[model samples]
Target: GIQMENSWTISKEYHIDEEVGFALPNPQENLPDFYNDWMFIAKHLPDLIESGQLRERVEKLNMLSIDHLTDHKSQRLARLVLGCITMAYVWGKGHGDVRKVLPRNIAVPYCQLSKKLELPPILVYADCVLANWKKKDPNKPLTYENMDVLFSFRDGDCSKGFFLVSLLVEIAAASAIKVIPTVFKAMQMQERDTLLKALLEIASCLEKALQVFHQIHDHVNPKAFFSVLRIYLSGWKGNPQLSDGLVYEGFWEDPKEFAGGSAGQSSVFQCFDVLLGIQGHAAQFLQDMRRYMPPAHRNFLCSLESNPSVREFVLSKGDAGLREAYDACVKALVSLRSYHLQIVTKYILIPASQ
Candidate 1:
């Protein structure tokens, strides 16, 4: 007998697809013509910031209404567009004169959209990487060569490459995501072979995702990424520039702090951690990052966490093949996280100290 209760209900509820894990299933490229001003500013954001006209241009913008953006795709695009502009408005001028207050024009709509999406007003991985990309050619597959970001903080290949490579990694993990429910179902039925196969599939997919993650260096220059682009990704919380937090003018009476866009906010690795039951370091920090995720994704992680323990199943089976499969998943995760640390040391740690 089969039960539909343990099916891919959570995945569907969150718009997670077998093909595109946490990415917006079909992202809209442009908002309606009425919002051209927002699009215009977002499109030329890099140029505006480079010319020192970003503040002037953003200040000139009329506070547009988001009522027209009824569909999920359009709202996500709006968030992506506004999120970038918000960051550029604050940090565009560089760290020297970071603005404490986000003017009303950009702040109001961004706060509203964030509420609707159940995400923080600041840019997060979902806004920047999941919803920010578009295919160069609609006819082609969503490969690295085919994808490009809708908006970028910088005017070169580095920003686009960084976003697209991240997108590719999400795409690569789709294989594991597709089978997570199956793994759960197999565990419920105590089917060792099915569980083994799914665990192995997850491990292989993680390996593939790692290969895509490594491609970041091929496109992004370390110096350019560190000096020019990384600041836009920074948020107000714990930032020395805005110790009291960023004040969104007209939206909040006091300054509000939020974390910057980070790979930690991505749901793919978190999903793996839940499935394999691997609890690494920084537990509290990682839990806090969950607030930055889309609510549905957060709920998905919660659902997995509440479900029967896959780790317990592996341990109880004691089958050599099952043990090896489980260990491979953990090893793949370790390797990926280690590689992440290495990249951060190269990009942020060493560069910041220098």
Candidate 2:
């Protein structure tokens, strides 16, 4: 007999944690001693960039081997470290005279690790935010105040704040993520009360997640973000400064373009969208963003899409409570997106115009 695995089994197979959703659970804080050179450069990226010596320092370094990174967590740490250093080397000089080719020392290992991880050879949300944080106090709960970024483009509250705020939103969405399988199972079994409860849980968690997302304004100064930190986050694609794309010295003969890190790459939103069956106006663009996500997380979204139909199940039931619960979840998602629009206007539109 053939059987399709339940959503719970699929989620677990993809490494989605019950408590952390798509984020790497218990991300390693450091790599093995073999990578001290790469770690050293990543550790003082801010200082190196400030002194206008990042390029020189990187140029002199030896091409480190990726042979020692045997586990997933350490590999992720290596990606984060190398990704940060590469960005610093390429865009550390600001908008003028950006480096079009990544040197062999970084380009080789980064491309190798990226090939294995199935992520692009550039800084991504999975590297910079998902696997990037540590708690200030180990015993404390995961809150914005309790967390900090392992590496940053600049030395200040702005860079730290920008990254940590996104991390918090991901943390807040875990409750909703944990209950998704329940919703799927309930729908399949035609269990109205169970479905209603799961939807309500989703709505409540989304509302709370939106609140955490809004805290970005409290910590990141718009002026500093636009003038300084934003450039480091830019990718070769769609960037006028690197219009032809970046070349990895030893890996590729032609240039390659990758979209920069963005909140749109987060799997949490896509998961909610799939559960609610909301095809947004930017469907094509959002689909494009999925390429930036970690492969397993991307596959998880695909798994969810092919599973039982939540929206159809609710609509067919014609049950008042089920309808209301489902609608509440949609409404909550709308609020989160609306706020995200307001943030884009503030952080990108207003600043760029001026």
Candidate 3:
């Protein structure tokens, strides 16, 4: 390490009740990969971007993504989704107060949206989650039944905004899954690595999704942000209806296995199935293509530090493609917005919820 930038990376070993020894990497460290840790969390970058300059190269790559920008409402929803993400992330990462306040912010919107739909207390709450994808536009047409097509974004922003917000919401939700199976409390640090790895994969693909949708809205469906990573992870490549594997099998597993399902034939498992089934992804060979990362993901973390405009979280920093991949994806969205103007006009920037 350079003299000016020299820092410490430390881990601890603890003694427990049993006659055994255990060690865990310190969750707190100087910084993780700039792209994964800093930028995505809004840590690095200019003031207009977020906090102080990242003082890292990866920050440069992450913030260089100014190429993509959303209208006010879309951007706002993304922030809100991010807010939800922060809540879920903190809860999963083990923070209590931040998690407590999350429902207040997330629930008010859920309540209003559900009341408008005349849905029952729970269904309304579930279907109109603060960041649900079925958004609509208020300025355009009028329809109450399928109004899920209109969320705060579409009614407030543009068609593309609606969709981008949808993706953001889904990303927030997918990340929320970590809150599932509280059994994680019992997991060893290495066992926790499973969740961290899945989290990184989903986050990177989310960037790919934002990129693809910005470039091509009509072709972009909820599946892009919700399902891609699972498919790519399970090595399932085919029509979802026919795709056979843990992904689908677990998806359609059984209604009885769900805790949140009350309506007919509805199950939390199915919802989660849909949740993980439709996101954008790197090509199948992505795993084989990238070089192997070191034990602590040093290479990926170094990449983030390279850009001084990202955040610094340990788990997220190990990302390899990082800010550049995210940057390229953002560029794709800008291009798609311009090229698909006609499509966007017809579908992206419309209003029907009002």
lDDT of 1 by residue, 220-286 (tens): 8888888888888889998888999989888899999899977689887788887888854587778
Residue 342: error of model 2 in Å?
A: 0.8
Local lDDT at 266 for model 3: 14
What TM value does model 2 have? 0.95
C-alpha RMSD in Å of predicted model 2 compared with the true structure: 2.3
Model 2 C-alpha lDDT versus the unseen true structure: 0.85
- Please, what are the lDDT tens digits per residue for candidate 3 over residues 1-354? 111111221121111101100111111112224214322433221122122222222213322121122232232233333322322222221211111122223233323332333332121112223223332554532122223422221112232333333333333333323332221221223344553544444445444444434443443443332222111111112323223311111112421110111111112122232222211264432322221111122222233233322222222556554434334433433443354455434442342211
Which residue runs does candidate 3 get wrong by more than 4 Å?
1-196, 212-354
> Over all chains combined, what TM-score does candidate 1 have?
0.95
Alpha-carbon deviation at 169 in model 1, angstroms: 0.7
Instruction: List the candidates' TM-scores in order.
Output: 0.95, 0.95, 0.20
Clashes of each: 0, 0, 51
Per-residue alpha-carbon lDDT of candidate 2 for residues 19-112, written as tens digits (9 for 90 to 100): 7777888789988888898898999988899899899999998977899999999999999999999989998758586888999889999999
